[PDB]
Design an enzyme around this catalytic site. Structure first.
Site, PDB file in Angstrom:
ATOM      1  N   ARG B  19      28.595  92.663  53.696  1.00 43.78           N
ATOM      2  CA  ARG B  19      28.115  91.414  53.250  1.00 43.78           C
ATOM      3  C   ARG B  19      27.794  90.360  54.494  1.00 43.78           C
ATOM      4  O   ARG B  19      28.778  90.246  55.272  1.00 43.78           O
ATOM      5  CB  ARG B  19      29.392  90.660  52.345  1.00 43.78           C
ATOM      6  CG  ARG B  19      28.981  89.108  52.091  1.00 43.78           C
ATOM      7  CD  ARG B  19      30.187  88.556  51.189  1.00 43.78           C
ATOM      8  NE  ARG B  19      30.095  88.896  49.727  1.00 43.78           N
ATOM      9  CZ  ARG B  19      30.950  88.493  48.991  1.00 43.78           C
ATOM     10  NH1 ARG B  19      31.975  87.795  49.146  1.00 43.78           N
ATOM     11  NH2 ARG B  19      30.816  88.947  47.601  1.00 43.78           N
ATOM     12  N   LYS B  33      26.661  96.522  59.810  1.00 39.18           N
ATOM     13  CA  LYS B  33      27.682  96.178  60.815  1.00 39.18           C
ATOM     14  C   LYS B  33      28.310  97.215  61.648  1.00 39.18           C
ATOM     15  O   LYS B  33      29.075  96.696  62.605  1.00 39.18           O
ATOM     16  CB  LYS B  33      28.716  95.319  60.006  1.00 39.18           C
ATOM     17  CG  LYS B  33      28.555  94.217  59.261  1.00 39.18           C
ATOM     18  CD  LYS B  33      29.625  93.569  58.625  1.00 39.18           C
ATOM     19  CE  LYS B  33      29.159  92.577  57.542  1.00 39.18           C
ATOM     20  NZ  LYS B  33      30.302  91.967  56.642  1.00 39.18           N
ATOM     21  N   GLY B  47      31.823  88.306  64.038  1.00 46.01           N
ATOM     22  CA  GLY B  47      31.419  86.990  64.707  1.00 46.01           C
ATOM     23  C   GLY B  47      30.050  86.528  64.466  1.00 46.01           C
ATOM     24  O   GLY B  47      29.363  86.574  63.436  1.00 46.01           O
ATOM     25  N   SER B 129      37.014  87.993  59.415  1.00 50.36           N
ATOM     26  CA  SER B 129      37.604  87.101  58.490  1.00 50.36           C
ATOM     27  C   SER B 129      38.594  87.762  57.433  1.00 50.36           C
ATOM     28  O   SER B 129      39.645  87.329  56.863  1.00 50.36           O
ATOM     29  CB  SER B 129      36.662  86.438  57.595  1.00 50.36           C
ATOM     30  OG  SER B 129      35.892  87.125  56.828  1.00 50.36           O
ATOM     31  N   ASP B 166      39.073  88.709  50.703  1.00 50.95           N
ATOM     32  CA  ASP B 166      38.393  87.757  51.793  1.00 50.95           C
ATOM     33  C   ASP B 166      37.040  87.342  51.067  1.00 50.95           C
ATOM     34  O   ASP B 166      36.423  88.139  50.783  1.00 50.95           O
ATOM     35  CB  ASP B 166      38.286  88.330  52.944  1.00 50.95           C
ATOM     36  CG  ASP B 166      37.532  87.491  54.028  1.00 50.95           C
ATOM     37  OD1 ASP B 166      37.539  86.041  53.925  1.00 50.95           O
ATOM     38  OD2 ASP B 166      36.716  87.750  54.592  1.00 50.95           O
ATOM     39  N   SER B 169      33.886  88.587  53.059  1.00 52.76           N
ATOM     40  CA  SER B 169      33.732  90.114  52.774  1.00 52.76           C
ATOM     41  C   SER B 169      33.176  90.398  51.446  1.00 52.76           C
ATOM     42  O   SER B 169      33.482  89.753  50.376  1.00 52.76           O
ATOM     43  CB  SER B 169      34.853  91.016  53.467  1.00 52.76           C
ATOM     44  OG  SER B 169      35.255  90.535  54.660  1.00 52.76           O
TER      45      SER B 169
END
Lengths: 233, 220, 213, 238, 234, 202, 204, 217, 245
Positions: B19, B33, B47, B129, B166, B169
């Site tokens: 995400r 990612k 980040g 996060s 989270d 995410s």
């Protein structure tokens, strides 16, 4: 302390010649010979890696160097200059990749390297490189073979030779070679045109070969070169 | 964002969610990612996205140059050094949080790298996060010298913890398995998340949009 | 944070006569509520015809003083003569303006003789704005000294009083009186009073005691 | 002739010809002499005029209250060095509030003048200096050459026909340390005088004097302020 | 055979400076006379064609209201030094509020003496000496002064001085006729006389320029009529 | 963070906790805060992790080149001086409290403190970090001239245990390292190996 | 905010063997509209367009410098630029100003000039690239556009349906944003042709 | 330095007959923490001068290094010249003013004492470049506590013996230990005479606490 | 051993037989210089210099060829004097910087290596010329011992027990090899130094001269100092008397 000579070491003669460039070319046409053949489905680079003693570890320095994953180099002339040009070419390739996130086209690499070579024929306090380069590459489906000379000029070849006896190697290529050849046949005729000069027993450690198909550039293992040097396989 | 990394018996498992958010709005449902550094080294990034992108690409490039010159496969310490020194030089203004993992001649190695330039070498790390959830999963169910599938299960579990706990995410789970003689870039691992099937057909028919001006331009 | 300035107190006075110039100052160097020293005069002899008074931030006073000295020597080397009073005034103006964006916290008053032998006073602001005056007080007790001098020397607001030029004697006792009053009302002014008299004969220095509280 | 044109080129015999040629520039200048007592340091210099309708060249320059110089050679290089010395003295007074020691000023001159005798396209300073000073170690006379070498002298003379002065000074060294000011300036004037044919002699027109001492800042005398010194000399006849 | 611009001759001189001195010997001759009544400067224009406007020939310029300058040799090189001198005077006025002494201006211009060189320098530095000789004539606290400067940088005060091609002859002629009590009239007269002696063309009102600086009067360049009134008294 | 160094006869003893926090969260509960600068020179880090890591690397580099160029075992005072230079020159941009300790054939076992300012002082014993505050008294009442190596070991172990008990920014595991001419002896005290103290009940 | 100073909206949408890109036409300064014909979509070669929303100055400037570098590219190499390559180029251009960024969030839409495979993407103000297989949006009415696009977009749409979809999405999203609108323009591009339309829209 | 860290408090100084005495406790404080209780804040600068520093200890170490190098550099020449105390004072003034003007000050307040040519020297230098001479000096809280005592004595007996000065200094240091919460009962005394610079080791101040038993009445 | 056909105009140019003649010419400038010797014993190092006087007008102690490089390091030079002084300044700065950066007195071997690298830096380019001087560095410490190094215009640096430079190099060395300095003390050595100097001096070609002498050892607590007038004159007397045999 040091600064630098800011004037050209390469100047026009009254005849209109850039003498230092032609002397550099003389240095090229005195080095070990190299052959390059573009063959429909691939490209072959080969050179005479003949040492001067059994003491030399031939598994330490190479003449056929990779620039990226899809581009290769060989040379004729002075070694150290070639090494410089190799570092520089790799750097250029990586800059291109950082900006475009796309592997550098062979022609573009050739142009940039050639520009670097041209700088050393006009900038201050330096002599030109004593090196001719053969650059092979796979980009946009097609195969590519270029040559760049000390003047900074470059040419696209279907096949060519440089170094000692490059004229006779060139004629040999013009006759005993043409298109629609598979990379294997090309390697064959490449070792064949190198053999038109290699004074002595041409072993698997006397020459170095590199290939470039659409799977990437790579140096041939000494074993593979032995199998090819069995006048067969 | 939830990224994690773990060290198992034969190498390293990296994990990430997919995400990408702008504010509190999902922009990308399938963001990658897990970044290529070298054939034996990979890096998860959290980040500031652009910073992780450029940092990771730059280091990949410099490492390709390095290995090209050395003729050998890059070491993980090298990547760690380059990253941490570059990042320290910029004093945290480059918002790259990284999980760096790879396999060397010296074996498998996992570092976590913070935007200020500090690093930690650990058997398991989390960033992002959703890092606390994943870290909970690790601290509860991690053992040294795990097997491949067990490690993959653990990491995917941690990433899932992040995903469901989270808001930063979500979506899919990507894994990257790196061993002494294998590279499993599974993308994605398993999407535990799906848009519900459309109940309606809001298809607009030709002519329903009023047009003031048209201009056709033939190409070639 | 950090402040590069501190107020060090000090009062300064200068009077111009027909053939003389007086430059006086107290000798107290203070900071906050404390006395750094009681023997620190604000007068500096530059040439044999020119004296300068500097009040304010002591660090800048010192620095500025040394800069002026060096530059006097330079003008001498370069022109084979000494600087006139006016020249020193002008040069000071430029030196002060060179720090327009990080000023010397210094109030300067030059007193001396011009080239006709007449008394000359130049007063300055911290960035080099300067004019010529008959008399000027600068420093902490400036607002106490100025109005009396406007009265007793300028004869302002005085009806049917003869306009007799200021004699050295009267000027001296005037300086002493105003500094004595200032020492009463200004907590920064006291300890001692140094007077520099400038005439064709050269520079005299007199010292009078003030109260130490 | 191929080791002649660059200061960076050693000769095959261990010499640098540009430095020596530069040294020759000192000899082209009018003679100057410098001597010291135990309390005073004196420079005496023979000025020199182009035509009769031109004034006589300045030979003595003021550096600091305790230091003065006499020049011989290229005047531009002389003024260059003079400004350098002045600036160094000013710097020293600014930072330490004490006068700059003469030997250190000289050392600085050596350091500065050595530099361009080693860099390509640079030239040596074409000027010789005599430096008169007074500090905590008393009076001082120094000599600086274009070779960037320097000497602490008891007395010295440089310039055209200065060998004579050198000889005279070399005779009366033992007297100097106990002489009084008048006698010292006298000796300097005689040393300067021996650098002339019998036809010409000292005047209040072609002599400059410079004195510094324990009771006297560096001062320059010429024209009519020289007369008290000259009018007290023995009319040395051929 | 090429050597550096900062090379010494075995005699102990700089080749470029000496060659510049040689370059002056081709310049128009100029005469300056110092007098307690003022300083005069005279120079020949050397018109090479009737088509050339002679008023566009200025070998005498005002440095400031109390200082003039006469130049000989390479005028193009002189323009730079003149401008530098003017700027210098104006800076001195700005800083100190007082005029420059003639000796100070002269010294200032003389500071640009041997400021040439190849290596170890700014990219905007001079490559060669100025091929020009200067005569500064002014009035200050020390009265009327006259200074002379050459490419060596050496400047000196002079009572009466000649620069240019006919330098030697004119200087001798000056020596024969100068005493420290002449009038300004005698000075100007003498100057014009010697000038006529050394000039190859016939001396007239549009053939030379003449300027004076007196203690009561700012720098003055003589007009055509003012010149005629003087040439009348040959 | 709690770091500690005690000098004895044959050399030194180093101790540190293992907690690295970002706020109240523990980013690393098992940090190595004893960092080798040379073969027999260590540093204890405290403050910004990035800063201390960077500085330690730089000093290691410089000191390595220096020792090679001199062909001698480097002085502890030299490593300490290098740390001092960096930490003082960039005092406004670094947050680092360092303790340099080690052995040296010329001056033996030594401990230097380089606190946040950039000053440098040699000490018999040194403590640093957030937790140090809580053990100043203990370390002052427990220290004794002429301790043996094992005594110093137990000493630092105890002090660090106390600090870790009280300080929230300190905890995890204890890392010890003895340094002498013999070499470097590193050990780790965890769980029950960590000294305990009778907690108040009724 | 800086991005909301001029407002505006840009959207791109994938089709079958086609692709679409749209933008509103308003140029305003805060509450005040200055012009209704502001160009926010720029041709970067045949079958390759870029959409720029945000600060108008940086829209124009980024467009211009992009055309600069692009022209140089197409000269050095003997080819039109590939979409991925254009995206990387823009990314580089934007990241060069990492610490003083242009305030624009570009959207790229085009067909591979060799093949015909549709490509869409969007980037940060500092050039973080994002490719999707459905749609991309940028502007002051991003949430609105997301809302419409998530409900209207079908996978394999033909040119007409792609048009109707992107048009309705743009219109209805923009009509809930005060600083976007004053007209909509749509470029729908396919292998053989390019259709450019201006929609009938509200002008308030 | 923008934010001082480890700091030292007051420094005392007083002239006497043929000499100068300077006093300073051996404490480096980290805020309110008495962190380093055995550091010297007094330096010998050649044979005729000495220095005491209040403020940031790191900056004092820097100045100590620079000054040391200057002294060594000078003594290398052996030209029969040496920095006078007034010269060191001048230099220090110039340095502090320079750093101040770069907005990067050395957070120190320094007292320079010396003896040369039969005269005593005592100078004060600020971190802003405020400098002056006085027969008595006290930095920090000494300026509020010790200086009134010192001045009281010196305005009733301007000429002190070494013993009277030492006693005065001990009393002042005692008062400071009573009223300054960032001082320490362990100090150094440095003395310059013609014999050179002597730095006497760790001295303690005797204290009286009888007033502890004057609560009720 | 003498090729001069343009092959000797620059330090950036090799001779066809593999030599750099500029450096050789600088060395030759050293050879034409007055002789200076230095000798190391078991409790320090001693320096001696034959300082030729060119004029009686020059003061005693003018043109010193003995330098204080650091408080523990002394320097003896031979060759072009100004160059020697510049190199002395370089050495001083190197030592100073070493102290500032590392906290302690610079080891002699290291100072030698540094200054020698600096000297070598001038033998590579056409833009600068090699230093026309050779120099010796002497030092003593309890942690390092007594050390004596020598550096030539090429940049070569070696450690010595005894060394000499200038005109009478080899003669001086022959005189030196007669000493058993590894067992003698600096005290005993000073006399021998003065002696060797007086021997090696040529009073016919070179006129008057002045003898310079330098201590550095345990007797001086590691401080490089000048030899006292007493010991100096003692050694001189010993020399003059030893000269009559």
């Amino acid at each position: 302390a040091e600064r630098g000579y800011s004037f050209s070491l390469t100047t026009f003669s009254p005849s209109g010649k850039l003498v230092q460039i032609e002397y550099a070319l003389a240095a090229v046409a005195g080095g070990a010979p190299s052959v390059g053949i573009k063959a429909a489905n691939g490209v072959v680079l080969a050179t005479e890696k003949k040492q001067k003693s059994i003491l030399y570890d031939e598994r330490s320095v190479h003449k056929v160097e990779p620039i990226t994953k899809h581009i290769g180099l060989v040379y004729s002339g002075m070694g150290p200059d070639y090494r410089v040009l190799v570092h520089r070419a790799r750097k250029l390739a990586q800059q291109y990749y950082l900006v475009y996130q796309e592997p550098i086209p062979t022609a573009q690499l050739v142009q940039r390297v050639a520009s670097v070579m041209q700088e050393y024929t006009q900038s201050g306090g330096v002599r030109p490189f004593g090196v001719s380069l053969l650059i092979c590459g796979w980009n946009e489906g097609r195969p590519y073979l270029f040559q760049s000379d000390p003047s900074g000029a470059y040419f696209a070849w279907k096949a060519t030779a440089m170094g000692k006896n490059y004229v006779n190697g060139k004629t040999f290529l013009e006759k005993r070679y043409n298109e629609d050849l598979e990379l294997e046949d090309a390697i064959h005729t490449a070792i064949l045109t190198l053999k038109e000069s290699f004074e002595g027993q041409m072993t698997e450690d006397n020459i170095e070969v590199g290939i470039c198909n659409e799977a990437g550039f790579r140096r041939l293992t000494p074993t593979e070169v032995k199998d090819y040097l069995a006048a067969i396989a | 964002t939830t990224i994690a990394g773990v060290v198992y018996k034969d190498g390293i498992v990296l994990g990430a969610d997919t995400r990408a958010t702008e504010g509190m709005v999902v922009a990308d449902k399938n963001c990658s990612k897990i970044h290529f550094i070298s054939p034996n080294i990979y890096c998860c990034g959290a980040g500031t996205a652009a910073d992780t992108d450029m940092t990771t690409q730059l280091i990949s490039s410099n490492l390709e140059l390095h290995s090209l010159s050395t003729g050998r496969l890059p070491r993980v310490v090298t990547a760690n050094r380059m990253l941490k020194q570059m990042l320290f030089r910029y004093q945290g203004y480059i918002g790259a949080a990284l999980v760096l993992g790879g396999v060397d001649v010296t074996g498998p190695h996992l570092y976590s790298i913070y935007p200020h330039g500090s690093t930690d070498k650990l058997p398991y790390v989390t960033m992002g996060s959703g890092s606390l959830a994943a870290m909970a999963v690790f601290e509860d169910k991690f053992r040294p010298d795990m097997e491949e599938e067990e490690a993959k299960n653990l990491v995917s579990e941690a990433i899932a913890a992040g995903i469901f706990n989270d808001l930063g995410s979500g979506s899919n789970i990507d894994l990257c398995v790196i061993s002494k003689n294998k590279l499993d870039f599974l993308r994605p691992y398993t999407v535990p998340n799906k848009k519900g099937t459309r109940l309606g057909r809001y298809r607009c028919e030709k002519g329903t949009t009023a047009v003031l001006t048209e201009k056709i331009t033939p190409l070639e | 944070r950090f402040s590069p300035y501190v107020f060090n107190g000090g009062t300064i006075l200068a009077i111009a006569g027909e053939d003389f110039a007086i430059v006086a100052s107290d000798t107290r160097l203070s900071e906050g509520f404390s006395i750094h020293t009681r023997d620190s005069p604000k007068c500096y002899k530059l040439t044999d015809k020119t004296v300068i008074g500097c009040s304010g931030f002591h660090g800048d006073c010192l620095t500025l003083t040394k800069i002026i000295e060096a530059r006097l020597k330079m003008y001498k080397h370069s022109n084979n003569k000494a600087m006139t009073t006016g020249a020193i005034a002008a040069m000071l103006s430029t030196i002060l303006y060179s720090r327009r964006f990080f000023p010397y916290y210094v109030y300067n008053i030059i007193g001396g003789l011009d080239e006709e032998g007449k008394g000359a006073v130049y007063s300055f602001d911290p960035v080099g704005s300067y004019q010529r005056d008959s008399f000027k007080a600068g420093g902490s007790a400036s607002a106490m000294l100025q109005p009396l001098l406007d009265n007793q020397v300028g004869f302002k607001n005085m009806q049917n009083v003869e306009h007799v030029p200021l004699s050295l004697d009267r000027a001296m006792r005037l300086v002493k009186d105003v500094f004595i009053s200032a020492a009463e009302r200004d907590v920064y002014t006291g300890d001692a009073l140094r007077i520099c008299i400038v005439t064709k004969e050269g520079i005299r220095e007199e010292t009078v005691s003030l109260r130490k509280d | 002739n191929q080791y002649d044109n660059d200061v960076t080129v050693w000769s095959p015999q261990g010499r640098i010809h540009q430095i020596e040629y530069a040294m020759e520039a000192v000899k082209q200048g009018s003679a100057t002499v410098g001597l010291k007592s135990k309390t005073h340091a004196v420079l005496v210099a023979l000025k020199r005029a182009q035509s009769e309708l031109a004034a006589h060249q300045k030979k003595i320059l003021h550096v600091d209250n305790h230091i003065g110089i006499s020049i011989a050679g290229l005047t531009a290089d002389a003024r260059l060095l003079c400004n350098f010395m002045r600036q160094e003295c000013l710097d020293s007074r600014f930072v330490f509030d004490r006068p700059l020691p003469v030997s250190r000023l000289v050392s600085l001159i050596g350091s500065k003048t050595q530099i361009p005798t080693q860099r390509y396209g640079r030239r040596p300073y074409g000027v010789g200096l005599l430096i008169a000073g007074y500090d905590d170690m008393g009076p001082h006379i120094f000599q600086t050459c274009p070779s960037a070498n320097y000497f602490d002298c008891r007395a010295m003379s440089i310039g055209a026909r200065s060998q004579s002065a050198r000889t005279y000074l070399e005779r009366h060294m033992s007297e100097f340390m106990e002489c009084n000011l008048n006698e010292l300036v006298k000796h300097g004037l005689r040393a300067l005088r021996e650098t002339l044919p019998a036809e010409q002699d000292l005047t209040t027109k072609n002599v400059s004097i410079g004195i510094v001492g324990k009771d006297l800042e560096f001062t320059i005398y010429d024209d009519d302020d020289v007369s008290p010194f000259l009018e007290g000399l023995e009319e040395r006849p051929q | 055979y090429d050597r550096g611009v900062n090379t010494f001759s075995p005699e102990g001189r700089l080749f470029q400076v000496e060659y510049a001195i040689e370059a002056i010997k081709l310049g128009s001759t100029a005469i300056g006379i110092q007098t307690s009544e003022g300083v005069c400067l005279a120079v020949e224009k050397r018109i090479t064609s009737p088509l050339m406007e002679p008023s566009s020939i200025e070998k005498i310029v005002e440095i400031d209201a109390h200082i003039g300058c006469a130049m000989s040799g390479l005028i193009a090189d002189a323009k730079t030094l003149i401008d530098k001198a003017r700027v210098e005077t104006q800076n001195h006025w700005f800083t100190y509020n007082e005029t420059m002494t003639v000796e100070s201006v002269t010294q200032a211009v003389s500071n640009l003496a041997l400021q040439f060189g190849e290596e170890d320098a700014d990219p905007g530095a001079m490559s060669r000496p100025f091929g020009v000789a200067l005569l500064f004539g002014g009035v200050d606290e020390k009265g009327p002064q006259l200074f002379h400067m050459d490419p060596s940088g050496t400047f000196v005060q002079c009572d009466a001085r000649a620069i240019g091609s006919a330098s030697e002859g004119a200087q001798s002629s000056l020596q024969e006729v100068y005493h420290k009590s002449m009038t300004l009239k005698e000075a100007i007269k003498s100057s014009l006389i010697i000038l006529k002696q050394v000039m190859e063309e016939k001396l007239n009102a549009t053939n030379i320029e003449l300027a004076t600086v007196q203690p009561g009067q700012n720098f003055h360049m003589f007009t055509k009529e003012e010149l005629e009134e003087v040439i009348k008294d040959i | 963070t709690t770091i500690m160094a005690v000098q004895f006869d044959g050399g030194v003893v180093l101790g540190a906790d293992s907690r690295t926090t970002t706020g109240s969260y523990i980013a690393n509960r098992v940090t190595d805060k004893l960092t080798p600068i040379h073969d027999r020179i260590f540093c204890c880090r405290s403050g910004s992790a990035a800063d201390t890591q960077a500085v330690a690397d730089a000093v290691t580099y410089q000191l390595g080149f220096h020792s090679i160029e001199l062909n001698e075992p480097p002085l502890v005072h030299t490593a300490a001086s290098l740390f001092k230079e960096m930490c003082y020159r960039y005092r406004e941009d670094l947050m680092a409290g360092i303790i340099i300790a080690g052995w040296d054939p010329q001056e033996g076992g030594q401990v230097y403190s380089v606190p946040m300012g950039g000053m440098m002082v040699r000490q018999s014993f040194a403590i640093g970090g957030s937790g140090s505050s809580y053990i100043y008294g203990y370390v002052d009442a427990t220290y004794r001239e002429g301790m043996t190596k094992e005594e110093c070991l137990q000493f630092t172990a105890n002090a660090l245990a106390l600090a870790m008990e009280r300080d929230g920014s300190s905890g995890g595991v204890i890392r010890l390292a003895a340094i002498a001419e013999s070499g470097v002896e590193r050990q780790v005290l965890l769980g029950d190996q960590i000294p305990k103290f009778a907690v108040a009940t009724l | 905010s800086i991005m909301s100073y001029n407002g505006g909206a840009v959207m791109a949408m994938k089709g079958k063997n086609c692709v679409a890109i749209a933008a509103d036409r308003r140029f305003g300064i805060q509450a005040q509209m200055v012009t209704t014909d502001f160009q926010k979509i720029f041709p970067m070669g045949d079958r390759l367009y870029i959409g720029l929303a945000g600060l108008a100055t940086d829209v124009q400037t980024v467009a211009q410098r992009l055309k600069f570098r692009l022209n140089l590219y197409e000269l050095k190499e003997g080819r039109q630029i590939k979409p991925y390559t254009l995206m990387s180029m823009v990314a580089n251009l934007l990241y060069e100003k990492r610490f003083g960024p242009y305030y624009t969030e570009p959207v790229i839409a085009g067909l591979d000039p060799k093949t015909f495979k549709p490509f869409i993407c969007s980037l940060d103000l500092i050039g973080c690239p994002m490719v999707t297989d459905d749609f991309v949006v940028s502007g002051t009415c991003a949430e609105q556009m997301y809302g419409m696009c998530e409900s209207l977009w079908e996978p394999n749409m033909d040119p007409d349906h792609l048009f109707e979809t992107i048009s309705q999405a743009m219109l209805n999203a923009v009509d809930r944003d005060a600083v976007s609108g004053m007209g909509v323009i749509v470029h729908i591009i396919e292998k053989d042709k390019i259709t450019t339309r201006t929609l009938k829209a509200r002008m308030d | 330095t923008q934010n001082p860290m480890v700091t030292g408090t007051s420094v005392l100084g007083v002239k006497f007959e043929g000499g100068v005495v300077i006093a300073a406790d051996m404490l480096g404080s980290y805020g309110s923490l008495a962190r380093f209780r055995n550091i010297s804040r007094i330096m010998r600068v050649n044979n005729s001068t000495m220095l005491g520093a209040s403020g940031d200890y790191a900056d004092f170490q820097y100045l100590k290094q620079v000054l040391g190098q200057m002294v060594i550099d000078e003594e290398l020449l052996g030209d029969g010249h040496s920095y006078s105390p007034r010269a060191i004072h001048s230099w220090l003034t110039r340095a502090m003013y320079s750093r101040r003007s770069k907005m990067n000050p050395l957070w120190n307040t320094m007292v320079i004492g010396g003896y040369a040519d039969g005269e005593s020297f005592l100078g004060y230098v600020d971190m802003l470049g405020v400098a002056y001479e006085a027969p008595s000096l006290a930095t920090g809280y000494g300026a509020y506590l010790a200086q009134p005592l010192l001045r009281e004595v010196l305005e009733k007996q301007p000429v002190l013996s070494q013993t009277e000065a030492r006693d005065l200094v001990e009393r002042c240091m005692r008062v400071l230990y009573y009223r300054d919460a960032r001082s320490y009962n362990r100090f150094q005394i440095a003395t310059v005479t013609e014999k050179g610079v002597e730095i006497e080791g760790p001295l303690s101040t005797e204290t009286n606490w009888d007033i502890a038993h004057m609560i009720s009445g | 051993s003498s090729i001069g056909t343009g092959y000797d105009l620059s330090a950036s140019t090799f001779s066809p037989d593999g030599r750099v003649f500029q450096v050789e010419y600088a060395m030759k400038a050293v050879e034409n210089s007055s002789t200076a010797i230095g000798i190391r014993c078991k409790d320090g190092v001693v320096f001696g210099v034959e300082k030729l006087v060119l004029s009686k007008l020059y003061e005693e102690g003018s043109n010193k060829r003995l330098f204080n490089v650091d408080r523990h390091v002394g320097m003896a030079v031979a060759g072009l004097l100004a160059d020697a002084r510049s190199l002395a300044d370089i050495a001083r700065e190197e030592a100073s910087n070493f102290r500032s950066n590392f906290g302690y007195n610079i080891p002699l071997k290291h100072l030698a290596d540094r200054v020698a690298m600096y000297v070598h830096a001038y033998t590579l380019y056409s833009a600068v010329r090699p230093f026309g001087c050779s120099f010796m560095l002497g030092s003593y410490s309890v942690n390092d011992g007594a050390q004596l190094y020598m550096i030539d215009p090429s940049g070569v640096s070696y450690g010595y027990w005894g060394c000499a430079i200038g005109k009478a190099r080899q003669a001086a060395k022959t005189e030196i090899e007669k000493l058993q300095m590894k067992e003698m003390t600096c005290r005993d050595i000073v006399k021998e130094v003065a002696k060797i100097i007086y021997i090696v001096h040529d009073e016919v070609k070179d006129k008057a001269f002045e003898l310079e002498l330098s201590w550095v050892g345990e007797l001086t607590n590691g401080r490089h100092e000048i030899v006292p007038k007493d010991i100096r004159e003692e050694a001189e007397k010993y020399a003059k008397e030893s000269l009559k045999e």
